Design a protein around this ligand. Structure first.
Ligand SMILES: Nc1ncnc2c1ncn2[C@@H]1O[C@H](COP(=O)(O)OP(=O)(O)OP(=O)(O)O)[C@@H](O)[C@H]1O
Ligand SMILES: Nc1ncnc2c1ncn2[C@@H]1O[C@H](COP(=O)(O)OP(=O)(O)OP(=O)(O)O)[C@@H](O)[C@H]1O
Ligand SMILES: [Ca+2]
Ligand SMILES: [Ca+2]
Lengths: 40, 359, 364
């Protein structure tokens, strides 16, 4: 900043703070899986 | 079965059709349409050849590619109305196409299915891929050989590789021809009236592939080990020997019908060589065979032998010959269409009405 | 989260992105773009390597510096539209850069963010600094080591000291290489198809730093104290011993991959020596480590030992190894962007439209 604004930002940082707490491939996979087919 | 999906695989010689979820085609009929030779207005299938005598017969599918769109329509009509006994407009319909099918064809087909048959939803899938699916794989190289054409299709993660596809205009229709030829060259009067039919049955009943052609010839020359017999209906019995394995040999040596092309082992090897060096391992170990012309006893092991000889000594080879491979393609489709992760892949009439055939 | 700030840290190997105020990146994906090798038109991230086989893969970020601006655009697009599922034009966006990033680069980046993405406001911050912030300090010396490059960054009252920055073109991408090499030199067939992936997992699961390399070698030579095992998926189990600590040793002895450069302890010491003699005290007692290549067990104490030996006997040394240092940089940014004394520090589209791309360079 280069002004008296930089010192408060700085101070604020040191202070601390929390932080909020945190299709083709499936078709393919399904195919390999297998399947039964109604008998005729 | 209503509001269920339809599967329709149109071969050069045979149409296979049925319902998704079923383990097999409910309908298998000749892919031919006959119109009155002189002047009802059209026949299709078994009935068309039953009356071949008063009609001009035609084959909409040549080389696995649709060439006659009018006749192809009559086939699809006969499929829905006369075989499956269903109404197209209440069944999503999956259809199959040849490798290397021109885009204008695919669109022409999508365009008919929607405008003329008014099916709610549709999908076009490449025949070889379905075969692969049927085997439970999404990576490998298929050898599809039906009545009209033969392809080698390399596939990686559900997608075919067009740069690496090998086409071979040699299939069962010409093998039956070859056999008919030889048979006759030995005093067996054969024509088309009904003979052509017998020659085909002899083919599927008696022909097989030699593991070693040169070696197999010598066997049938020194003993009757390999003779087999076939009684015609007329009554006249006939005996076959080396003809049982010389006929299928044409697949490995096309120079038997005078084609200066290369055999299916070579095209299989060439097809793989045409692929990324890192996926060859997967391909060599996943040769899936489909089509009715792959049904010959001994073809699996001949292929295994031939390929082991063409490839690196270190590579593990593997041939998969499903006993149901005559219908692999159709089965492959039957499976796909029924899967739930697939239900979003359908082309809806709505989607088509907005974008166009190019969707 | 809408009308909130975005934080985007672009590593050489990994992109980290998310929302300011969040304790972690919602999106971490490979920093690579793939275009059809022959003739859709572009892939990015996991999907790009999933299909590496039919694409030409490229890395926009080399040595922590952006070198391919077209590809870098595709990355940012994929970040907003496909990962975060947001619209850039309604989110102030904070971005990160390497120490010693050329001014033309910073401006080129500011210029794209505004003209192409039309973000309302933006800021560029130096990655190392954010790490420091994340630890709650505004003075200290950071050791940032990611996938592509390693820096020592001395910082005093929120400002980095460019004359004193040490760059080291040795990071995790080459350590994985080194490990892949050795492993194979012992009969383990390893290639890139999928192996390269395993070799990296073995790295992050089994490698560690020896407190005394010579001493640690002798241990793994006289007993099996240090053997550990890893079952490949194929099935083949494999055992590792001294390889667990020889691989990370490359950070202290680059002459292991044949680099006639000096180790991170030396560059850390050299970097401090390059600073004002009055702030060295503060620096020695505030070594903050960031990056995924600093995650090795034992690295904190090895560093503590090495530095105590290089420095004056009277100076108090201290290494700070946040357990979250893999994501320090991003976290550092997440914090900054959310602070209120910071909200006046944003570069507005307005400010950019008046002055130009150069409205993003301040001293002090
Ligand atoms: N057991 C068998 N032995 C040898 N050949 C057989 C056997 N069963 C069927 N065939 C041959 O398979 C052919 C039909 O197979 P298929 O239905 O796979 O081909 P298609 O899909 O109609 O044509 P294409 O795939 O070439 O376009 C026929 O020519 C038939 O002679
Ligand atoms: N537990 C671990 N042990 C060792 N190395 C690890 C661990 N976790 C991650 N890494 C390494 O950290 C690297 C990625 O870290 P990071 O995301 O900080 O780098 P980057 O920002 O993408 O690249 P750079 O900062 O070099 O431009 C990878 O090479 C990875 O192997
Ligand atoms: Ca067919
Ligand atoms: Ca980084």
């Amino acid at each position: 900043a280069c002004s008296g604004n930089k010192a408060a930002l700085l101070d604020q940082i040191r202070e601390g703070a929390q932080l909020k707490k945190v299709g083709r491939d499936a078709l393919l996979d399904q195919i390999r899986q297998g399947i039964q087919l109604k008998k005729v | 079965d209503e509001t269920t999906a339809l599967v329709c695989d149109n071969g050069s010689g045979l149409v296979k059709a049925g319902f998704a979820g079923d383990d097999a085609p409910r309908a298998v009929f000749p892919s031919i349409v006959g119109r009155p030779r002189h002047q009802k207005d059209s026949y299709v299938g078994d009935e068309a050849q039953s009356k071949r005598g008063i009609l001009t017969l035609k084959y909409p599918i040549e080389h696995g590619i649709i060439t006659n769109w009018d006749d192809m329509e009559k086939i699809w009509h006969h499929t829905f109305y006369n075989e499956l006994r269903v109404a197209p407009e209440e069944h999503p319909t999956l259809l199959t196409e040849a490798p290397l099918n021109p885009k204008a064809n695919r669109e022409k087909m999508t365009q008919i299915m929607f405008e003329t048959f008014n099916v709610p939803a549709m999908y076009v899938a490449i025949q070889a891929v379905l075969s692969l699916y049927a085997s439970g794989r999404t990576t490998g190289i298929v050898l599809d050989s039906g009545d009209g054409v033969t392809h080698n299709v390399p596939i990686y993660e559900g997608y075919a590789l067009p740069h690496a596809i090998m086409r071979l205009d040699l299939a069962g229709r010409d093998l039956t021809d070859y056999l008919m030829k030889i048979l006759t060259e030995r005093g067996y009067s054969f024509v088309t009236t009904a003979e052509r039919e017998i020659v085909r049955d002899i083919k599927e009943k008696l022909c097989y592939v030699a593991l070693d052609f040169e070696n197999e010839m010598a066997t049938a020359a020194s003993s009757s080990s390999l003779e087999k017999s076939y009684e015609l209906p007329d009554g006249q019995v006939i005996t076959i020997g080396n003809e049982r394995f010389r006929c299928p040999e044409t697949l490995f040596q096309p120079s038997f019908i005078g084609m200066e092309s290369a055999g299916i082992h070579e095209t299989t090897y060439n097809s793989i060589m045409k692929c990324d060096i890192d996926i060859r391992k997967d391909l060599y170990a996943n040769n899936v065979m489909s089509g009715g012309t792959t049904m010959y006893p001994g073809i699996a092991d001949r292929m295994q032998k031939e390929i082991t000889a063409l490839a690196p000594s270190t590579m593990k080879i593997k041939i998969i010959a499903p006993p149901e491979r005559k219908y692999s393609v159709w089965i492959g489709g039957s499976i796909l269409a029924s899967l739930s992760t697939f239900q979003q892949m359908w082309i809806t009439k709505q989607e088509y009405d907005e974008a166009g055939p190019s969707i």
